């Protein structure tokens, strides 16, 4: 996160770290055995880490659970990043409490102007790499489709939305991929891509979760 602040230990209880010997993406806990992330974060050998704050130290509250299966959306296109969503089933259910909790799926899409919280252990510099130890947060508004599309002409599909600041300085970045964009207590986005990080007129692009609520439910129900 660039231009973000320290969230505070466990203040974001649905945030998970996807790890394979190092943190590479984020994800959101939606129920004791399922997490939602970005299809582009897929790999084998993923251990899901819950109750994390500082990713390099064990401080208590952490639950490390291996992933049983990752389900990349059947229509994910790695060249356009359209349908950039994946579901991971955990080997065992997580113990939920106030430090580890799931987040709710939306009943409706959100509108431009809605303020959302984005979190992650991704890069904090726009020019260079600086990865934090603790979880960073950023409050960002969903942008209008005309501003999104004027920013990335021909690259936005209807399963994407832009959120951020066109002046630059505050944005999500690499390492945050796969994680949550929560608005009014509902998971509305998944960190997906953008051009550089916190650059002027290049806001972040997120996977529009409201368009997959039925797919997520049908898939969890059949697995
Ligand atoms: N400007 C933004 N709001 C933004 C948001 C998410 C991003 N993710 C990335 C990104 C860049 C290089 C590699 C990535 O994923 C690989 C790391 C782990 C496995 C996949 C990214 O997600 C850039 C990037 C930029
Ligand atoms: Ca830790």
Q: What CATH number did the domain enclosing 49 receive?
A: 2.40.10.10
Q: Does 56 lie in the same domain as 144?
A: no
Would you call 53 a catalytic residue per the annotation? no
Q: Does 204 lie in the same domain as 215?
A: no
Angle (nearest 5°) at CA 142 between 209 and 50: 50
- Structure-block tokens of residue 1: 């996160």
Please identify every residue whose CB atom is under 5 Å from ligand 2, which is an ion.
Answer: 52, 54, 57
How many separate domains does the chain show?
2
Q: How far is the CA of 97 from the centre of ligand 1 (A)?
A: 30
> Could you tell me the residue range of the domain that residue 178 belongs to?
1-12+103-210
Per the CB < 8 A criterion, the answer to whether 26 and 189 are in contact is: no
Q: Does 158 lie in the same domain as 110?
A: yes
Q: Does 182 lie in the same domain as 73?
A: no
2 marked ligand binding residue: no
Torsion angle of alpha carbons 183, 186, 192, 193, nearest 10°? -10
Give the whole-angstrom CA distance, residue 113 versus residue 115: 6
Q: Does 76 lie in the same domain as 142?
A: no
**Which atom number of ligand 1 is nearest to the Cα of residue 205?**
3
Q: What is residue 219's three-state secondary structure?
A: helix
Would you call 23 a catalytic residue per the annotation? no
How many helices, marked H, and strands, marked E, lie in the chain?
A: 2, 13
**Which atom number of ligand 1 is nearest to the Cα of residue 164?**
3
Angle (nearest 5°) at CA 117 between 105 and 198: 125
Pocket residues for ligand 1 (CB within 6 Å)?
24-25, 40-41, 171-174, 176-177, 191, 193-194, 197, 204
User: How were these coordinates obtained?
Assistant: X-ray
DSSP string covering 143-187, please? PPHHHHHHHSTTT--TTEEEES-TT-S-B--TT-TT-EEEETTEE
**Which atom number of ligand 1 is nearest to the Cα of residue 197?**
1
Would you call 126 a catalytic residue per the annotation? no
With CA atoms as reference, report the closest residue to 177 among 191, 163, 166, 195: 191
72 marked ligand binding residue: no
Q: How far is the CA of 150 from the centre of ligand 2 (A)?
A: 40
Q: Does 107 lie in the same domain as 95?
A: no
From the list 40, 119, 176, 192, the catalytic residue is 40
Q: Does 20 lie in the same domain as 8?
A: no
Per the CB < 8 A criterion, the answer to whether 87 and 34 are in contact is: yes
Q: Does 77 lie in the same domain as 146?
A: no
Phi, psi of 2, rounded to the nearest 5 degrees: -115, 140
DSSP string covering 44-100, please? SS-EEEES-SSTTS--S--EEEEEEEEEE-TT-BTTTTBT--EEEEESSPPPPSSSS
């Amino acid at each position: 996160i660039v231009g973000g602040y320290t969230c505070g230990a466990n203040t974001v209880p649905y945030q998970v770290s996807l790890n394979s010997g190092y943190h590479f993406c984020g994800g959101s806990l939606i129920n004791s055995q399922w997490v939602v992330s970005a299809a582009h974060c897929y790999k084998s050998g993923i251990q899901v880490r819950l109750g994390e704050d500082n990713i390099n130290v064990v401080e208590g509250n952490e639950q490390f659970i291996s992933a049983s299966k990752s389900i990349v959306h059947p229509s994910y296109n790695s060249n356009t990043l359209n349908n950039d969503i994946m579901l991971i089933k955990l080997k065992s259910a997580a113990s939920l409490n106030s430090r580890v909790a799931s987040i709710s799926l939306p009943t409706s899409c959100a509108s431009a102007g809605t303020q959302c919280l984005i979190s992650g252990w991704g890069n904090t510099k726009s020019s260079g790499t600086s990865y934090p130890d603790v979880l960073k947060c950023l409050k960002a508004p969903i942008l209008s489709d005309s501003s999104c599309k004027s920013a990335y002409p021909g690259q936005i599909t209807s399963n994407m939305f832009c959120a951020g600041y066109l002046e630059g300085g505050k944005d999500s970045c690499q390492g945050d991929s796969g994680g949550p964009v929560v608005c009014s207590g509902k998971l509305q986005g998944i960190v997906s891509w953008g051009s550089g990080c916190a650059q002027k007129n290049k806001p972040g692009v997120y996977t529009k979760v409201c368009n997959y609520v039925s797919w997520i439910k049908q898939t969890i129900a059949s697995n």
